[PDB]
Amino acid sequence: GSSGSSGRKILDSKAIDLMNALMRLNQIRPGLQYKLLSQSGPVHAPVFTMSVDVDGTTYEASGPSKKTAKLHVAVKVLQAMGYPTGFDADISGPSSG
């Protein structure tokens, strides 16, 4: 439930101008929760698929590491609302979300 929580405080800026998004998502929507739908692939090239619920919209983004996974997810959320994330000119193809 909600009542009776420990509270995990983890923070690290190992990346470069990337975590920015992670902090943002929390800035606009404090008290968020990230979960790993599933992980596939090798041990050196694992795929950490994270997921988050924002504004009644569930976002899922996979990455090379859980750390990047959560970050990628946020970037999307913002992009959906129309907020600056730090990425462009990256056409996806003939298929869109």
Side-chain angles (χ1 to χ4, degrees):
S2 271
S3 176
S5 277
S6 272
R8 305 187 66 196
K9 208 166 276 275
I10 300 84
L11 77 84
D12 300 87
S13 57
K14 287 277 167 79
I16 302 172
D17 210 314
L18 296 203
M19 51 85 226
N20 275 305
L22 270 173
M23 282 67 166
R24 289 272 163 284
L25 205 67
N26 300 301
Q27 277 289 24
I28 48 168
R29 315 284 287 180
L32 291 150
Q33 72 183 104
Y34 309 85
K35 180 72 192 275
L36 201 70
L37 302 170
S38 178
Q39 177 287 334
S40 208
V43 76
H44 80 264
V47 179
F48 283 83
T49 300
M50 271 278 149
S51 70
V52 79
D53 209 38
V54 181
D55 202 289
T57 329
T58 309
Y59 299 85
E60 317 85 9
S62 54
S65 299
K66 204 182 295 196
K67 57 199 203 271
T68 314
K70 270 150 66 158
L71 172 89
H72 285 205
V73 163
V75 175
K76 293 159 83 59
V77 183
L78 306 172
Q79 283 205 100
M81 317 209 258
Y83 279 121
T85 56
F87 272 109
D88 277 298
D90 283 307
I91 51 161
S92 276
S95 191
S96 82

Coordinates of all heavy atoms in Angstrom, one line a residue:
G1 N 0.8 -1.2 0.0 CA 0.0 0.0 0.0 C 0.8 1.3 0.0 O 1.9 1.3 -0.6
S2 N 0.3 2.3 0.7 CA 1.1 3.6 0.7 C 1.6 3.8 2.1 O 2.8 4.2 2.3 CB 0.1 4.7 0.4 OG 0.1 5.0 -1.0
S3 N 0.8 3.5 3.1 CA 1.2 3.7 4.5 C 2.2 2.6 4.9 O 2.1 1.5 4.6 CB 0.0 3.7 5.5 OG 0.4 3.8 6.8
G4 N 3.3 3.1 5.6 CA 4.3 2.1 6.0 C 5.4 1.8 4.9 O 5.4 0.7 4.4
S5 N 6.1 2.8 4.6 CA 7.2 2.7 3.5 C 8.5 3.0 4.1 O 8.7 3.9 5.0 CB 6.8 3.6 2.3 OG 5.9 3.0 1.5
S6 N 9.6 2.4 3.5 CA 10.9 2.6 4.0 C 11.5 3.9 3.4 O 11.9 4.8 4.1 CB 11.8 1.4 3.6 OG 11.8 0.4 4.6
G7 N 11.5 4.0 2.0 CA 12.0 5.2 1.4 C 13.4 5.0 0.9 O 14.3 5.2 1.7
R8 N 13.6 4.6 -0.3 CA 14.9 4.4 -0.9 C 15.4 5.7 -1.5 O 14.9 6.2 -2.5 CB 14.9 3.3 -1.9 CG 14.4 2.0 -1.4 CD 14.6 0.8 -2.4 NE 16.0 0.5 -2.6 CZ 16.4 -0.2 -3.6 NH1 15.6 -0.7 -4.5 NH2 17.7 -0.4 -3.7
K9 N 16.5 6.3 -1.0 CA 17.1 7.5 -1.5 C 18.4 7.2 -2.3 O 19.4 7.1 -1.7 CB 17.4 8.5 -0.4 CG 17.3 10.0 -0.8 CD 17.3 10.9 0.4 CE 15.8 11.1 0.9 NZ 15.1 12.1 0.1
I10 N 18.2 7.1 -3.6 CA 19.4 6.8 -4.4 C 19.6 7.9 -5.5 O 18.6 8.2 -6.2 CB 19.3 5.4 -5.1 CG1 19.2 4.3 -4.1 CG2 20.5 5.2 -6.1 CD1 17.8 4.1 -3.6
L11 N 20.8 8.4 -5.6 CA 21.1 9.4 -6.6 C 22.5 9.3 -7.1 O 23.5 9.0 -6.3 CB 20.9 10.8 -6.0 CG 21.9 11.3 -5.1 CD1 23.1 11.9 -5.8 CD2 21.3 12.3 -4.1
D12 N 22.7 9.4 -8.4 CA 24.1 9.4 -9.0 C 24.1 10.0 -10.4 O 23.3 9.8 -11.2 CB 24.5 7.9 -9.1 CG 24.6 7.2 -7.8 OD1 23.5 6.7 -7.3 OD2 25.6 7.2 -7.2
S13 N 25.1 10.9 -10.5 CA 25.2 11.6 -11.8 C 26.4 11.1 -12.6 O 27.2 11.9 -13.1 CB 25.4 13.1 -11.5 OG 26.5 13.4 -10.7
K14 N 26.5 9.8 -12.7 CA 27.6 9.1 -13.4 C 27.5 9.5 -14.9 O 28.6 9.6 -15.6 CB 27.5 7.6 -13.3 CG 27.9 7.1 -11.9 CD 29.4 7.0 -11.8 CE 29.8 6.7 -10.4 NZ 29.6 5.3 -9.9
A15 N 26.3 9.8 -15.4 CA 26.2 10.1 -16.8 C 26.5 11.6 -17.0 O 27.0 12.3 -16.1 CB 24.7 9.9 -17.3
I16 N 26.3 12.1 -18.3 CA 26.7 13.5 -18.6 C 25.5 14.2 -19.3 O 25.2 13.9 -20.4 CB 27.9 13.5 -19.5 CG1 29.1 12.9 -18.9 CG2 28.2 15.0 -19.9 CD1 30.3 12.7 -19.8
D17 N 24.9 15.1 -18.5 CA 23.7 15.8 -19.1 C 22.6 14.9 -19.5 O 21.9 15.2 -20.4 CB 24.2 16.7 -20.3 CG 23.3 17.9 -20.4 OD1 22.1 17.9 -20.3 OD2 23.9 19.0 -20.6
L18 N 22.5 13.8 -18.7 CA 21.5 12.8 -19.0 C 20.5 12.7 -17.9 O 19.3 12.9 -18.1 CB 22.1 11.4 -19.3 CG 23.0 11.3 -20.5 CD1 23.1 9.9 -21.0 CD2 22.5 12.2 -21.6
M19 N 21.0 12.4 -16.7 CA 20.1 12.3 -15.5 C 19.2 13.5 -15.4 O 18.1 13.4 -14.7 CB 21.0 12.3 -14.2 CG 22.0 13.4 -14.1 SD 21.4 14.9 -13.4 CE 22.0 16.1 -14.6
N20 N 19.5 14.6 -16.1 CA 18.7 15.8 -16.1 C 17.2 15.4 -16.2 O 16.4 15.9 -15.4 CB 19.0 16.7 -17.3 CG 20.2 17.6 -16.9 OD1 20.2 18.4 -16.0 ND2 21.3 17.6 -17.7
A21 N 16.9 14.5 -17.1 CA 15.5 14.1 -17.3 C 14.9 13.4 -16.0 O 13.9 13.8 -15.5 CB 15.4 13.1 -18.4
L22 N 15.7 12.5 -15.5 CA 15.3 11.8 -14.2 C 14.8 12.8 -13.2 O 13.8 12.6 -12.6 CB 16.4 10.9 -13.7 CG 16.5 9.5 -14.2 CD1 17.7 8.8 -13.8 CD2 15.2 8.7 -13.8
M23 N 15.7 13.8 -12.9 CA 15.4 14.8 -11.9 C 14.1 15.6 -12.3 O 13.3 15.9 -11.4 CB 16.6 15.7 -11.8 CG 17.7 15.2 -10.9 SD 18.5 13.8 -11.7 CE 20.0 13.7 -10.8
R24 N 14.0 15.8 -13.6 CA 12.8 16.6 -14.1 C 11.5 15.8 -13.7 O 10.6 16.4 -13.1 CB 12.9 16.8 -15.6 CG 14.0 17.8 -16.0 CD 13.5 19.2 -16.0 NE 14.5 20.2 -16.0 CZ 15.2 20.5 -14.9 NH1 15.0 19.9 -13.7 NH2 16.2 21.4 -15.0
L25 N 11.4 14.6 -14.2 CA 10.2 13.8 -14.0 C 9.8 13.9 -12.5 O 8.6 14.0 -12.2 CB 10.5 12.3 -14.3 CG 9.3 11.5 -14.7 CD1 8.7 12.0 -16.0 CD2 9.6 10.0 -14.8
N26 N 10.8 13.9 -11.6 CA 10.5 14.0 -10.2 C 10.1 15.4 -9.8 O 9.2 15.6 -8.9 CB 11.7 13.5 -9.4 CG 12.1 12.1 -9.7 OD1 11.4 11.2 -9.5 ND2 13.4 11.9 -10.1
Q27 N 10.6 16.4 -10.5 CA 10.3 17.8 -10.2 C 8.9 18.0 -10.5 O 8.2 18.6 -9.6 CB 11.2 18.7 -11.0 CG 12.6 18.9 -10.4 CD 12.5 19.8 -9.2 OE1 11.5 19.9 -8.5 NE2 13.6 20.5 -8.9
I28 N 8.4 17.6 -11.6 CA 7.0 17.8 -12.0 C 6.1 16.9 -11.3 O 5.0 17.2 -10.8 CB 6.8 17.7 -13.5 CG1 7.5 16.4 -14.0 CG2 7.3 18.9 -14.2 CD1 7.1 16.0 -15.4
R29 N 6.5 15.6 -11.1 CA 5.7 14.6 -10.4 C 6.6 13.9 -9.4 O 7.2 12.9 -9.6 CB 5.2 13.6 -11.4 CG 4.6 14.2 -12.7 CD 3.3 14.8 -12.5 NE 2.2 13.7 -12.3 CZ 1.0 14.0 -12.1 NH1 0.5 15.2 -12.0 NH2 0.1 13.0 -11.9
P30 N 6.5 14.5 -8.1 CA 7.3 13.9 -7.0 C 6.7 12.6 -6.5 O 5.5 12.4 -6.6 CB 7.2 15.0 -5.9 CG 5.9 15.8 -6.3 CD 5.8 15.7 -7.8
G31 N 7.6 11.8 -6.0 CA 7.1 10.5 -5.4 C 6.7 9.5 -6.5 O 5.5 9.1 -6.6
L32 N 7.6 9.2 -7.4 CA 7.3 8.3 -8.5 C 7.8 6.9 -8.2 O 8.6 6.7 -7.3 CB 8.0 8.8 -9.8 CG 7.4 10.1 -10.4 CD1 8.4 10.9 -11.1 CD2 6.2 9.7 -11.3
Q33 N 7.3 5.9 -9.0 CA 7.7 4.5 -8.8 C 8.1 3.9 -10.1 O 7.3 3.9 -11.1 CB 6.6 3.7 -8.1 CG 5.4 3.5 -9.0 CD 4.3 2.8 -8.2 OE1 3.3 3.4 -7.9 NE2 4.5 1.5 -8.0
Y34 N 9.2 3.2 -10.2 CA 9.7 2.6 -11.5 C 9.7 1.1 -11.2 O 10.2 0.6 -10.2 CB 11.0 3.1 -11.9 CG 11.1 4.6 -12.0 CD1 11.3 5.4 -10.9 CD2 10.8 5.3 -13.2 CE1 11.4 6.8 -10.9 CE2 10.9 6.7 -13.3 CZ 11.1 7.4 -12.1 OH 11.2 8.8 -12.2
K35 N 9.3 0.3 -12.2 CA 9.3 -1.2 -12.2 C 9.9 -1.7 -13.4 O 9.8 -1.2 -14.5 CB 7.9 -1.7 -11.9 CG 7.8 -3.2 -11.9 CD 8.4 -3.7 -10.6 CE 8.6 -5.2 -10.6 NZ 7.4 -6.0 -10.2
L36 N 10.5 -2.9 -13.3 CA 11.1 -3.6 -14.4 C 10.2 -4.7 -15.0 O 10.2 -5.8 -14.4 CB 12.5 -4.2 -14.0 CG 13.5 -4.5 -15.2 CD1 14.0 -3.2 -15.8 CD2 14.6 -5.3 -14.7
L37 N 9.5 -4.4 -16.1 CA 8.6 -5.4 -16.7 C 9.3 -6.7 -16.8 O 8.8 -7.7 -16.4 CB 8.1 -4.8 -18.0 CG 7.4 -3.5 -18.0 CD1 7.2 -3.0 -19.4 CD2 6.1 -3.6 -17.3
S38 N 10.5 -6.7 -17.5 CA 11.2 -7.9 -17.7 C 12.6 -7.6 -18.3 O 12.8 -6.5 -18.8 CB 10.5 -8.8 -18.6 OG 11.2 -10.0 -18.9
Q39 N 13.5 -8.5 -18.1 CA 14.9 -8.4 -18.7 C 15.3 -9.5 -19.6 O 15.1 -10.7 -19.2 CB 15.9 -8.2 -17.5 CG 17.3 -8.1 -17.9 CD 17.9 -9.4 -18.5 OE1 17.4 -10.5 -18.1 NE2 18.9 -9.4 -19.3
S40 N 15.8 -9.2 -20.7 CA 16.2 -10.2 -21.7 C 17.6 -9.9 -22.3 O 18.1 -8.8 -22.2 CB 15.2 -10.4 -22.8 OG 15.2 -11.7 -23.3
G41 N 18.2 -10.9 -22.9 CA 19.5 -10.7 -23.5 C 20.7 -11.3 -22.7 O 20.4 -11.9 -21.7
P42 N 21.9 -11.0 -23.1 CA 23.1 -11.5 -22.5 C 23.3 -10.9 -21.1 O 22.5 -10.1 -20.7 CB 24.2 -11.2 -23.4 CG 23.7 -10.0 -24.2 CD 22.2 -10.2 -24.3
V43 N 24.4 -11.2 -20.5 CA 24.8 -10.6 -19.2 C 25.5 -9.3 -19.3 O 25.5 -8.5 -18.5 CB 25.6 -11.6 -18.3 CG1 27.1 -11.6 -18.9 CG2 25.6 -11.2 -16.9
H44 N 26.2 -9.2 -20.5 CA 27.0 -8.0 -20.7 C 26.1 -7.0 -21.5 O 26.4 -5.8 -21.5 CB 28.2 -8.3 -21.5 CG 28.0 -8.5 -23.0 ND1 27.8 -9.7 -23.5 CD2 27.9 -7.6 -24.0 CE1 27.7 -9.6 -24.8 NE2 27.7 -8.3 -25.1
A45 N 25.1 -7.5 -22.2 CA 24.3 -6.6 -23.0 C 22.8 -6.9 -22.7 O 22.0 -7.1 -23.6 CB 24.5 -6.8 -24.5
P46 N 22.5 -6.8 -21.4 CA 21.1 -7.0 -20.9 C 20.2 -5.9 -21.2 O 20.6 -4.8 -21.4 CB 21.3 -7.1 -19.4 CG 22.6 -6.4 -19.1 CD 23.4 -6.6 -20.3
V47 N 18.9 -6.2 -21.3 CA 17.9 -5.2 -21.6 C 17.0 -4.9 -20.5 O 16.1 -5.7 -20.2 CB 17.1 -5.6 -22.9 CG1 16.0 -4.5 -23.2 CG2 18.0 -5.8 -24.1
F48 N 17.2 -3.8 -19.8 CA 16.4 -3.5 -18.6 C 15.1 -2.7 -19.0 O 15.2 -1.5 -19.3 CB 17.2 -2.7 -17.6 CG 18.1 -3.5 -16.8 CD1 19.3 -3.9 -17.2 CD2 17.7 -4.0 -15.5 CE1 20.2 -4.7 -16.5 CE2 18.6 -4.8 -14.7 CZ 19.8 -5.1 -15.2
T49 N 14.0 -3.3 -19.1 CA 12.8 -2.7 -19.5 C 12.0 -2.1 -18.3 O 11.4 -2.8 -17.5 CB 11.8 -3.7 -20.2 OG1 12.5 -4.2 -21.4 CG2 10.5 -3.0 -20.6
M50 N 12.1 -0.8 -18.2 CA 11.4 -0.1 -17.1 C 10.0 0.4 -17.5 O 9.7 0.4 -18.7 CB 12.2 1.1 -16.6 CG 13.2 0.7 -15.5 SD 12.5 0.6 -13.9 CE 13.5 -0.6 -13.1
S51 N 9.2 0.8 -16.5 CA 7.9 1.3 -16.8 C 7.4 2.3 -15.7 O 7.7 2.1 -14.5 CB 6.9 0.1 -16.9 OG 6.7 -0.5 -15.6
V52 N 6.7 3.3 -16.1 CA 6.2 4.3 -15.1 C 4.8 4.8 -15.6 O 4.5 4.8 -16.7 CB 7.1 5.5 -15.0 CG1 7.0 6.4 -16.2 CG2 6.9 6.2 -13.7
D53 N 4.0 5.2 -14.6 CA 2.7 5.7 -14.8 C 2.6 7.2 -14.5 O 2.8 7.7 -13.4 CB 1.7 5.0 -14.0 CG 0.3 4.9 -14.6 OD1 0.2 4.8 -15.9 OD2 -0.7 5.1 -13.9
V54 N 2.3 8.0 -15.5 CA 2.2 9.5 -15.4 C 1.0 10.0 -16.2 O 0.9 9.7 -17.3 CB 3.5 10.2 -15.9 CG1 3.4 11.7 -15.7 CG2 4.7 9.6 -15.1
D55 N 0.2 10.9 -15.5 CA -0.9 11.5 -16.2 C -1.8 10.4 -16.8 O -2.2 10.6 -18.0 CB -0.5 12.5 -17.2 CG -1.6 13.5 -17.5 OD1 -2.6 13.2 -18.1 OD2 -1.4 14.7 -17.0
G56 N -2.1 9.3 -16.1 CA -2.9 8.3 -16.7 C -2.2 7.6 -17.9 O -2.9 7.0 -18.7
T57 N -0.9 7.9 -18.1 CA -0.2 7.4 -19.3 C 1.0 6.6 -18.8 O 1.9 7.1 -18.2 CB 0.2 8.5 -20.2 OG1 -0.7 9.6 -20.1 CG2 0.4 8.0 -21.6
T58 N 1.0 5.3 -19.2 CA 2.1 4.4 -18.9 C 3.2 4.4 -19.9 O 2.9 4.1 -21.1 CB 1.6 2.9 -18.6 OG1 0.5 2.9 -17.8 CG2 2.7 2.1 -18.1
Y59 N 4.4 4.7 -19.5 CA 5.5 4.7 -20.4 C 6.5 3.6 -20.2 O 6.8 3.3 -19.0 CB 6.3 6.1 -20.3 CG 5.4 7.3 -20.7 CD1 4.6 7.9 -19.7 CD2 5.4 7.8 -22.0 CE1 3.7 8.9 -20.0 CE2 4.6 8.9 -22.3 CZ 3.8 9.5 -21.3 OH 3.0 10.5 -21.6
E60 N 7.0 3.0 -21.2 CA 8.0 1.9 -21.1 C 9.1 2.1 -22.1 O 9.0 2.2 -23.3 CB 7.3 0.6 -21.4 CG 5.9 0.4 -20.8 CD 4.8 1.1 -21.6 OE1 5.1 1.4 -22.8 OE2 3.7 1.2 -21.1
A61 N 10.3 2.1 -21.5 CA 11.5 2.3 -22.3 C 12.7 1.4 -21.8 O 13.0 1.3 -20.6 CB 12.0 3.7 -22.2
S62 N 13.2 0.6 -22.8 CA 14.3 -0.3 -22.4 C 15.7 0.3 -22.7 O 15.8 1.1 -23.6 CB 14.1 -1.6 -23.3 OG 14.0 -1.3 -24.6
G63 N 16.6 -0.1 -21.9 CA 18.0 0.4 -22.1 C 19.1 -0.7 -21.8 O 18.8 -1.8 -21.4
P64 N 20.3 -0.3 -21.9 CA 21.5 -1.1 -21.7 C 21.6 -1.4 -20.2 O 22.3 -2.4 -19.8 CB 22.7 -0.4 -22.2 CG 22.2 1.1 -22.2 CD 20.8 1.1 -22.4
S65 N 21.0 -0.6 -19.4 CA 21.1 -0.7 -17.9 C 19.9 -0.1 -17.2 O 19.4 1.0 -17.7 CB 22.4 -0.1 -17.4 OG 23.5 -0.7 -17.9
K66 N 19.5 -0.7 -16.1 CA 18.3 -0.1 -15.4 C 18.4 1.4 -15.2 O 17.4 2.1 -15.4 CB 18.3 -0.8 -14.0 CG 16.9 -0.8 -13.4 CD 16.9 -1.4 -12.0 CE 17.2 -2.9 -12.0 NZ 16.8 -3.5 -10.7
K67 N 19.6 1.9 -14.9 CA 19.8 3.3 -14.7 C 19.3 4.1 -16.0 O 18.6 5.0 -15.9 CB 21.3 3.6 -14.5 CG 22.2 3.1 -15.6 CD 23.6 2.9 -15.1 CE 24.6 3.0 -16.2 NZ 24.9 1.6 -16.8
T68 N 19.8 3.6 -17.1 CA 19.4 4.3 -18.4 C 18.0 4.0 -18.7 O 17.3 4.9 -19.3 CB 20.3 3.8 -19.6 OG1 21.7 3.7 -19.2 CG2 20.1 4.6 -20.8
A69 N 17.5 2.9 -18.4 CA 16.1 2.5 -18.6 C 15.1 3.5 -18.0 O 14.3 4.1 -18.7 CB 15.8 1.1 -18.0
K70 N 15.2 3.8 -16.7 CA 14.4 4.7 -16.0 C 14.5 6.1 -16.7 O 13.5 6.8 -16.8 CB 14.7 4.8 -14.6 CG 14.0 3.8 -13.7 CD 14.8 3.4 -12.5 CE 15.0 4.6 -11.5 NZ 15.3 4.1 -10.1
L71 N 15.7 6.5 -17.1 CA 16.0 7.8 -17.7 C 15.3 7.9 -19.0 O 14.6 8.9 -19.3 CB 17.5 8.0 -17.9 CG 17.9 9.2 -18.7 CD1 18.1 10.4 -17.8 CD2 19.2 8.9 -19.5
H72 N 15.4 6.9 -19.9 CA 14.8 6.9 -21.2 C 13.3 7.0 -21.0 O 12.6 7.8 -21.8 CB 15.1 5.6 -21.9 CG 16.5 5.5 -22.4 ND1 16.8 4.7 -23.5 CD2 17.6 6.2 -22.1 CE1 18.1 4.9 -23.8 NE2 18.6 5.7 -22.9
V73 N 12.7 6.3 -20.1 CA 11.2 6.4 -19.8 C 10.8 7.8 -19.6 O 9.8 8.3 -20.2 CB 10.8 5.5 -18.6 CG1 9.5 5.9 -18.1 CG2 10.9 4.0 -19.0
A74 N 11.5 8.5 -18.7 CA 11.2 9.9 -18.4 C 11.2 10.8 -19.6 O 10.2 11.4 -19.9 CB 12.2 10.4 -17.4
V75 N 12.3 10.7 -20.4 CA 12.4 11.5 -21.6 C 11.1 11.4 -22.4 O 10.6 12.5 -22.9 CB 13.5 11.0 -22.5 CG1 13.5 11.7 -23.8 CG2 14.8 11.1 -21.8
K76 N 10.5 10.3 -22.5 CA 9.2 10.1 -23.3 C 8.1 10.9 -22.6 O 7.5 11.7 -23.3 CB 8.9 8.6 -23.3 CG 9.8 7.8 -24.2 CD 9.7 6.3 -23.8 CE 8.6 5.6 -24.5 NZ 8.7 5.7 -26.0
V77 N 7.9 10.6 -21.3 CA 6.8 11.3 -20.6 C 6.8 12.8 -20.9 O 5.8 13.4 -21.3 CB 7.0 11.1 -19.1 CG1 5.8 11.8 -18.3 CG2 7.1 9.6 -18.7
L78 N 8.0 13.4 -20.8 CA 8.1 14.9 -21.0 C 7.8 15.2 -22.5 O 7.0 16.1 -22.7 CB 9.5 15.3 -20.7 CG 10.1 15.0 -19.3 CD1 11.5 15.3 -19.2 CD2 9.3 15.7 -18.3
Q79 N 8.4 14.4 -23.4 CA 8.1 14.6 -24.8 C 6.6 14.6 -25.1 O 6.1 15.3 -26.0 CB 8.8 13.6 -25.6 CG 10.3 13.8 -25.8 CD 10.9 13.2 -27.0 OE1 11.1 13.8 -28.0 NE2 11.2 11.9 -26.9
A80 N 5.9 13.8 -24.4 CA 4.4 13.6 -24.6 C 3.7 14.9 -24.2 O 2.8 15.4 -24.9 CB 3.9 12.5 -23.8
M81 N 4.1 15.5 -23.1 CA 3.5 16.7 -22.6 C 4.0 17.9 -23.4 O 3.4 19.0 -23.4 CB 3.9 16.9 -21.1 CG 3.7 15.7 -20.3 SD 3.3 16.0 -18.6 CE 4.9 15.8 -17.8
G82 N 5.2 17.8 -24.0 CA 5.8 18.9 -24.8 C 6.9 19.6 -24.1 O 7.0 20.8 -24.3
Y83 N 7.6 18.9 -23.2 CA 8.6 19.5 -22.4 C 10.0 19.2 -23.0 O 10.2 18.2 -23.7 CB 8.6 19.1 -21.0 CG 7.5 19.8 -20.1 CD1 6.5 19.1 -19.5 CD2 7.6 21.1 -19.9 CE1 5.6 19.7 -18.7 CE2 6.7 21.8 -19.2 CZ 5.6 21.1 -18.6 OH 4.7 21.7 -17.8
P84 N 11.0 20.1 -22.8 CA 12.3 20.0 -23.3 C 13.1 18.9 -22.6 O 13.3 18.9 -21.4 CB 13.0 21.3 -23.0 CG 12.2 21.9 -21.9 CD 10.8 21.4 -22.0
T85 N 13.5 17.9 -23.4 CA 14.2 16.7 -22.8 C 15.7 16.8 -23.2 O 16.6 16.5 -22.5 CB 13.6 15.4 -23.3 OG1 13.6 15.3 -24.7 CG2 12.2 15.2 -22.7
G86 N 15.9 17.1 -24.5 CA 17.3 17.2 -25.0 C 17.6 16.2 -26.1 O 18.5 15.4 -26.0
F87 N 16.7 16.1 -27.1 CA 16.8 15.2 -28.2 C 15.9 15.5 -29.4 O 14.8 16.0 -29.2 CB 16.5 13.7 -27.7 CG 17.7 13.0 -27.2 CD1 17.8 12.8 -25.8 CD2 18.8 12.6 -28.0 CE1 18.9 12.1 -25.3 CE2 19.9 11.9 -27.5 CZ 19.9 11.7 -26.1
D88 N 16.4 15.4 -30.6 CA 15.7 15.7 -31.8 C 16.3 15.1 -33.0 O 17.4 14.6 -33.0 CB 15.5 17.2 -31.9 CG 14.4 17.8 -31.1 OD1 13.2 17.3 -31.4 OD2 14.6 18.6 -30.2
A89 N 15.7 15.3 -34.2 CA 16.2 14.8 -35.4 C 16.6 13.3 -35.3 O 17.6 12.9 -35.9 CB 17.4 15.6 -35.8
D90 N 15.7 12.5 -34.7 CA 15.9 11.1 -34.5 C 14.7 10.3 -35.0 O 14.2 9.4 -34.3 CB 16.2 10.8 -33.0 CG 17.6 11.1 -32.6 OD1 18.5 10.7 -33.3 OD2 17.7 11.9 -31.6
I91 N 14.3 10.7 -36.2 CA 13.1 10.0 -36.8 C 13.1 8.5 -36.5 O 14.2 7.9 -36.4 CB 13.1 10.1 -38.3 CG1 14.5 9.7 -38.9 CG2 12.7 11.6 -38.7 CD1 14.4 9.4 -40.4
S92 N 11.9 8.0 -36.2 CA 11.8 6.5 -35.9 C 11.6 5.7 -37.1 O 12.0 4.6 -37.2 CB 10.6 6.4 -34.9 OG 11.0 6.6 -33.6
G93 N 10.8 6.3 -38.1 CA 10.6 5.5 -39.3 C 9.2 5.7 -39.8 O 8.5 6.6 -39.4
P94 N 8.7 4.8 -40.7 CA 7.3 4.8 -41.2 C 6.3 4.5 -40.1 O 5.1 4.6 -40.4 CB 7.4 3.7 -42.3 CG 8.4 2.7 -41.8 CD 9.5 3.6 -41.1
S95 N 6.7 4.1 -39.0 CA 5.8 3.7 -37.9 C 6.0 4.7 -36.7 O 7.1 5.1 -36.3 CB 6.1 2.3 -37.4 OG 5.1 1.9 -36.5
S96 N 4.9 5.2 -36.2 CA 4.9 6.2 -35.1 C 4.1 5.6 -33.9 O 3.3 4.7 -34.0 CB 4.2 7.5 -35.6 OG 2.8 7.5 -35.5
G97 N 4.3 6.2 -32.7 CA 3.6 5.8 -31.5 C 2.1 6.0 -31.6 O 1.5 5.9 -32.7

